[PDB]
Write a protein that binds this ligand. Structure first.
Ligand SMILES: *[C@@H]1O[C@H](CO[C@@H]2O[C@@H](C)[C@@H](O)[C@@H](O)[C@@H]2O)[C@@H](O[C@@H]2O[C@H](CO)[C@@H](O[C@@H]3O[C@H](CO[C@H]4O[C@H](CO)[C@@H](O)[C@H](O)[C@@H]4O)[C@@H](O)[C@H](O)[C@@H]3O)[C@H](O)[C@H]2NC(C)=O)[C@H](O)[C@H]1NC(C)=O
Ligand SMILES: *[C@@H]1O[C@H](CO[C@@H]2O[C@@H](C)[C@@H](O)[C@@H](O)[C@@H]2O)[C@@H](O[C@@H]2O[C@H](CO)[C@@H](O[C@@H]3O[C@H](CO[C@H]4O[C@H](CO)[C@@H](O)[C@H](O)[C@@H]4O)[C@@H](O)[C@H](O)[C@@H]3O)[C@H](O)[C@H]2NC(C)=O)[C@H](O)[C@H]1NC(C)=O
Lengths: 384, 219, 215, 384, 215, 219
């Protein structure tokens, strides 16, 4: 009884007297699954887990400039030059600076100057990509019982290579699961937190970038972006590094989906295609007889968001466990029970019954006899 | 030329039934495989059913299996779609698509019917309530007009000053509210220079209810 | 295991006469059994090309079909006014279902045009009846991406609104949108300030239109 | 001798035998000013100073949400409500949350929920506007002498109300200054630093804003921008505040002009229209005789960036102070001396002479006699 | 104390048929003695209006003059193809100089179009002569705001470049730019990688075009 | 109609002198006040000189005072501008502007001359060096053509394949280098499908030097 009254709920039913049923678990919602002469089961994707992700590119967000050197020449003698202009992880700009007798030169005019600084990254972020080969899904299967709560479920794991599993459902048998671990988006990881972002958006980030290789001395492409050169009055040229882009990134990531990371493991809302074989799932309480006493409802019958009605009834007879008589009417019609094979286990505890009534006016009668419970109901359908 | 023309659309209550027909002309009907493609409001095309030239084998998509059944009268040159147990989700425009075939359903060039609409809803036919889009002051241009609410089924036609005022109006697509009733708005921008000069009147026309409503709008 | 075709881009915005290329990517190889349809509203879809590169009889030579791997591309050499419509791919690989893509809209591209924003308070008549509908109008804006946010006094409204957009205008290739927020008059009259704040590319910062109840 | 060989240099000369001259000092460059039978003077705007600036708007960059309260109602009973929804400095959103028997409600469906948080600003920035009424210009006036250095100047202040000043130039008299303290741009001040930015750019900043008034309890317009509401799976709605926008602002201010602020005083590169009356400025050394010995140049004569030539000469005679003979030739022509009235003060110290030669070939002869100094020169003009 | 007229905006980008308004603001009151001239290249300026609102004989009634305070506005009701040109205000308040404004360019507005970027290395002939000119070309882009940055191997080049922009193309209303960077061959051959990196609105992130010397 | 036509432009060395004339037709010349407005390259209009209908009083802007002098021959219906001591800054297009006047210089409606150009420079006339815009591989479209360098004075005319190739060319505005010489570039984009098929030749034409240069361009 775990998915009544949830908006994100899917009904999938085994066609043509099937023994197997296809579900696509999309995290968040859950899938209620029925097959004929089988227990109805609520299935949902508890979490998706990823480990050992390949870094595709490293972007710097806080840099540092050191080892700064200058060289200037004079208005007659052409353009200044520094060997650091070809040394890597060095960012530089030429300007002209006013030259004359006072700063040392023979004649007057504008002379070449170039400032060169050694760039280094103090702290970086990574864009890691999600390998389908290290996803690990876990599915929770609870049986859509009438067991009491106003309204514990066994779980099974799915690796990409070990794609099959068996869920033991105590009292109902063994469900077999064969799911197929079936995204142009990157995990942007920054400082023990992570986001999921479009990847051309990531590749267009105005930040210095090296590749995913593990060398502790990488060359930073577009270093320039964290270094500003200022030659205001043609007397000097100053270089300074921009200071961390952590705040700017955070502001640019408000809309992004935040992702939990704790210890290399990261958790996703994933979508897993899958399907269930219930060949060794057969219902509880087919031995039991019909129920001879009367039934009365503990609450008002309630329509769920998907059109099914939920009914809580108390049985005040003494046949100890008994199958619950149930049908609908126009004019007899036999009802569509999502809580498959309702049975009263004990006269004190009430039971929940989820049923899909026909469209229009219908009469649900529970129990047997002529003072048995009758519930007038009218199901509307106005919007898809 | 090669052409199919369909009929049989309309309003159905949920769980009800309707049959659609699609009659063929201009080709030997027996040699064409037939298919049913539908399109729900604000959605893409859905390929749902198919039948061979001889009607000896059918295919149903999972969405319509066991409720819709596709059939073919070759002597009478027509294609049929008996839809049973309609749910609100079946509201759509239904096209029948024909194509010459040597294999069961496979075809290359095709021909489509006009498309017929069916609407399944518990909603009962109801005329629209019409309320005013009252303007206020900007003295350049300001907007005003009519709001057409709680009507069923589609459509309504909204005219402005009995057609004299056409430039600058936007009649918006009906949105279908949670009540199962429709609601739309028809607006026009006009200069505040002439707010107190020209009376602006809208003509709402829900002919399924045959309610025609003129509403005058002013500050 | 249905074959699913994924079309891209969702919307392709081009000026007339530009070259258009639309992609359809197949869940699995269908080898060449892919067809491109054009759908204009009011009409039935019209097969443009089939078997991935063969034109159907009577379609202009502008329409062009290409396939590499699972990726198929429909190419329009020069866009005519007639060619602004929606385009669907359909695979016919083995057996039904001959699934359709979700469509790509090809629209007329325009200079950015900021919307005219208007707010309309619930009418006295409708208030008498028992409900209240505030109506925010965005008039003649391009592009279509636009954000309407309803604000009650200090609260951002959610789940109580409905939008409707017109199709691109025949004369200025622009859009207009209407958002109506409906409340029971009961809840309507416990709050004072009703505003819609519009974010659009044509606006240097969002523009809000508000009123105070009863004035 | 303070503006030779500077690119930013302006030549303004007193027309029609004038005693007064109009200069527009734009900080950075300097203005060389000449009037007939007067000393040439180099004038520049040392700095511009502003104090007591009116804050026009306050923008929050780090906020805090406290006093958070929730209210929800149930699918049958309409929209939830909180009194804080009209209490000011409160930011709120409605959602719907799935309701049923398990969380407390009679029937099933989506029920109204609203979360309301009390917003407060932890740290803000100001957009202050520059009053022309509290600018304070200071001008440095140095006399365009030939006094020796390879190539101390008195300064004067200009308030907006006290718009006139007198600069004593020792040995040359008193220059009178009457300058007129003559911008759709705002001083964005953040955290003991400041920038100058376009003001619609400032007004469009996506940040919460109050007005300039000094009340310690202001109402923040567009608080919403620092608060995010998340209702992912319709089970709850969470509010959190964005954390400081200092980094984002800094990144958005790299292109802005940085402004020095230390103690409410802020320094600008300003533009001051002004003009100088030299009625009590008359040259040094008109008593002296002509110079009878020969002259020889210490360096090579050098063209400046504006076409004038700079000449360093040594005099090895004994007339102790003497006027320096100077003329140019095509063919005699009398020269245009920017260093007005050159005079040799001492035979050891050389002197500098700035002169504007005619276009084309010209011959500058210095000293008197026929073994006097003659310098062939050719002035080109190719670009404006 | 010259009177100085300040025109705004510097560039006014409008589609044909749109309403255009250009401002000229006077250093001090000139009362109505303000005239609007239109200047098309190759021709002399042409007086459109004078005394701030009076049209000169033979100009269309599109051209409109308004004055409030020191702020004068020229208004074009509907822009014709002919009206895309530069506009100057001139005051005639008291006595010469009858100063002119610095002009407002009215241009055709277009959809954003990213540039085609090309780089051209110095030719062997010119290298023989003794100088080297690298040439970066930006082809058919709108808007005109575009940033060309020359990069030598690790160094950002400054003060050694020159740009040239064509006027808006008669057919696609677009611009093209050519930046040439000239060095003495001496300095040219001490460096390996020559690149121009272009920033433009049509580019999601700048595009660089480079070469290595001699290859 | 009312019209003025000017003459007298050309090349002047710095410090040199030139006189511009501007002859009048279609109005009683004596009753028009005359003015001289100039426009430097890449700059706005500058109002520099003025003279009354009777030539009894002149006004000179500060930029030209004491170097330019404005005069008027009313009997010969012409206006004169004797420019002396030209500096490079005086390079400009000079317009003469006429207008009927009752007061000294004040006028309302006016008439402009065609405009004559004068260029002051130490630069000596020199033909251009022509170098190739060599293309490389993109096999869509690639760019190529000619570079016209170190020439003086303006202008050059650049044609493509003797006029057969016009679509896709951009001849750029000449930029005037620090040497006092001009430099421009003429480019065209063409498809790499036909890089080795059609020979691309440019025709550079500096007629002041009468140097005509055809340069063929290829990878
Ligand atoms: C780039 O700049 C660093 C200096 O780092 C700066 O420090 C501050 C104060 C600022 O000035 C910032 O600009 C920089 O952050 C140059 O020096 C390096 O750092 C220190 C000295 O500053 C050196 O550390 C030294 O190491 C000693 C160990 O003995 C020797 O061992 C090996 C044997 O070959 C030898 O290679 C090594 O260099 C040591 O000399 C030890 O006593 C102590 O730790 C001492 O500080 C460091 O080794 C320096 N690196 C060198 C010399 O390579 C960098 O040199 C400079 N980069 C250049 C010049 O390329
Ligand atoms: C908003 O929330 C604050 C609590 O602040 C939170 O603190 C942390 C732990 C988190 O929970 C965050 O959400 C917030 O930052 C409410 O309480 C106020 O703060 C403290 C208590 O938390 C109060 O300070 C008290 O003051 C005592 C002085 O005695 C009394 O003096 C006057 C006399 O009238 C009285 O008005 C005053 O309130 C004091 O009660 C002193 O012993 C000691 O400092 C003690 O902590 C503070 O006064 C509280 N403010 C009040 C009660 O107004 C706020 O109340 C809440 N805002 C609301 C409810 O509007």
């Amino acid at each position: 009884m775990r998915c009544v009254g949830v908006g994100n709920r899917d009904f999938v039913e085994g066609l043509s007297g099937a023994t197997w049923v296809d579900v696509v678990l999309e995290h968040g919602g859950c899938v209620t699954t029925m097959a004929k002469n089988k227990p109805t089961l609520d299935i949902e994707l508890q979490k998706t887990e990823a480990t050992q992700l390949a870094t595709l590119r490293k972007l710097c967000i806080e840099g540092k400039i050191t080892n700064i050197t200058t060289d200037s020449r004079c208005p007659t003698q052409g353009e200044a030059i520094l060997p650091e202009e070809q040394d890597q992880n060095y960012v530089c700009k030429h300007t002209y600076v006013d030259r004359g007798w006072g700063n040392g030169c023979g004649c007057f005019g504008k002379g070449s100057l170039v400032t060169c600084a050694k760039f280094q990254c103090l702290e970086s972020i990574e864009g890691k990509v999600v390998q389908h080969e290290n996803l690990k899904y876990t599915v929770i299967i609870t049986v859509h019982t009438g067991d009491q709560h106003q309204v514990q479920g066994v779980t099974a794991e799915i690796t990409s290579q070990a794609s099959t599993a068996e869920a033991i459902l105590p009292g109902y048998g063994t469900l077999g699961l064969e799911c197929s671990p079936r995204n142009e988006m990157i995990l942007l990881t920054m400082k023990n937190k992570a986001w999921m972002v479009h990847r051309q958006w990531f590749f267009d980030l105005p930040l210095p970038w090296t590749s995913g290789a593990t060398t502790e001395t990488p060359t930073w492409n577009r270093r320039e972006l964290l270094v500003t050169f200022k030659n205001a009055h043609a007397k000097k040229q100053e270089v300074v590094v921009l200071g961390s882009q952590e705040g700017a990134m955070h502001t640019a990531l408000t809309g992004a989906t935040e992702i939990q990371t704790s210890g290399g493991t990261s958790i996703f809302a994933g979508h897993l295609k899958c399907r269930l074989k219930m060949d060794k799932l057969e219902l509880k309480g087919m031995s039991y007889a019909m129920c001879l006493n009367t039934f009365v409802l503990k609450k008002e019958v309630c329509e769920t968001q998907h059109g099914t009605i939920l009914i809580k009834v108390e049985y005040k007879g003494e046949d100890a466990p008994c199958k619950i008589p149930f049908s609908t009417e126009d004019k007899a019609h036999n009802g569509r029970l999502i809580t498959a094979n309702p049975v009263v286990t004990k006269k004190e505890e009430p039971v929940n019954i989820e049923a899909e009534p026909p469209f229009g006016e219908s009469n649900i009668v529970i129990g047997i006899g002529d003072k048995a419970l009758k519930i007038n109901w009218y199901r509307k359908g106005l919007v898809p | 030329e090669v052409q199919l023309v369909e009929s049989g659309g309309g309003l159905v209550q949920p769980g009800g039934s309707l049959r659609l027909s699609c009659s063929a002309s201009g080709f030997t009907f027996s040699t064409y495989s037939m298919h049913w493609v539908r399109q729900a409001p604000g959605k893409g095309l859905e390929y749902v059913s198919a039948i061979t030239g001889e009607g000896d084998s059918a295919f149903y998509a999972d969405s319509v299996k066991g409720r819709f059944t596709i059939s073919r009268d070759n002597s009478k040159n027509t294609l049929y779609f008996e839809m049973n147990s309609l749910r609100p989700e079946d509201t759509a425009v239904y096209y029948c698509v024909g194509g010459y075939s040597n294999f069961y359903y496979y075809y290359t060039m095709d021909v489509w019917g006009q498309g017929t609409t069916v609407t399944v809803s518990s909603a009962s036919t109801k005329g629209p309530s019409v309320f005013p889009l009252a303007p206020s002051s900007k003295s350049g241009t300001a907007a005003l007009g009519c709001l057409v609410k709680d009507y069923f089924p589609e459509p309504v036609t909204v005219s402005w000053n009995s057609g004299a005022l056409t430039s600058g109006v936007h009649t918006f697509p009906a949105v279908l509210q949670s009540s199962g009733l429709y609601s739309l708005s028809s607006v026009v921008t006009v200069p505040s220079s002439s707010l107190g000069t020209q009376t602006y009147i809208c003509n709402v026309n829900h002919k399924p209810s045959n309610t025609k409503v003129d509403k005058r709008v002013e500050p | 295991s249905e074959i699913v075709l994924t079309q891209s881009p969702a919307t392709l915005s081009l000026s007339p006469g530009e070259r258009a290329t639309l992609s359809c990517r197949a869940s699995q190889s269908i080898s060449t059994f892919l067809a491109w349809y054009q759908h204009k509203p009011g009409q039935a879809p019209r097969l443009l090309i089939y078997d991935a590169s063969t034109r159907a009889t009577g379609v202009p030579a502008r329409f062009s079909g290409s396939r590499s791997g699972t990726d198929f591309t429909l190419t329009i050499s020069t866009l005519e006014p007639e060619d602004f419509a929606v385009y669907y791919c359909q695979q016919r690989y083995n057996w039904p279902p001959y699934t359709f893509g979700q469509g790509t809209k090809v629209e007329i591209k325009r200079t950015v045009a900021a919307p005219s924003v208007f707010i309309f308070p619930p009418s006295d008549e409708q208030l008498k009846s028992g409900t209240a509908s505030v109506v925010c109008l965005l008039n003649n804006f391009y592009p279509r991406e636009a954000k309407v946010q309803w604000k009650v006094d200090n609260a951002l409204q959610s789940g109580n609104s409905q939008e409707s957009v017109t199709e691109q205008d025949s004369k200025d290739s622009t859009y207009s949108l209407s958002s109506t927020l409906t409340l029971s008059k009961a809840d309507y009259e416990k709050h004072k300030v009703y505003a819609c704040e519009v974010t659009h590319q044509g606006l240097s910062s969002p523009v809000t239109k508000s009123f105070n109840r009863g004035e």
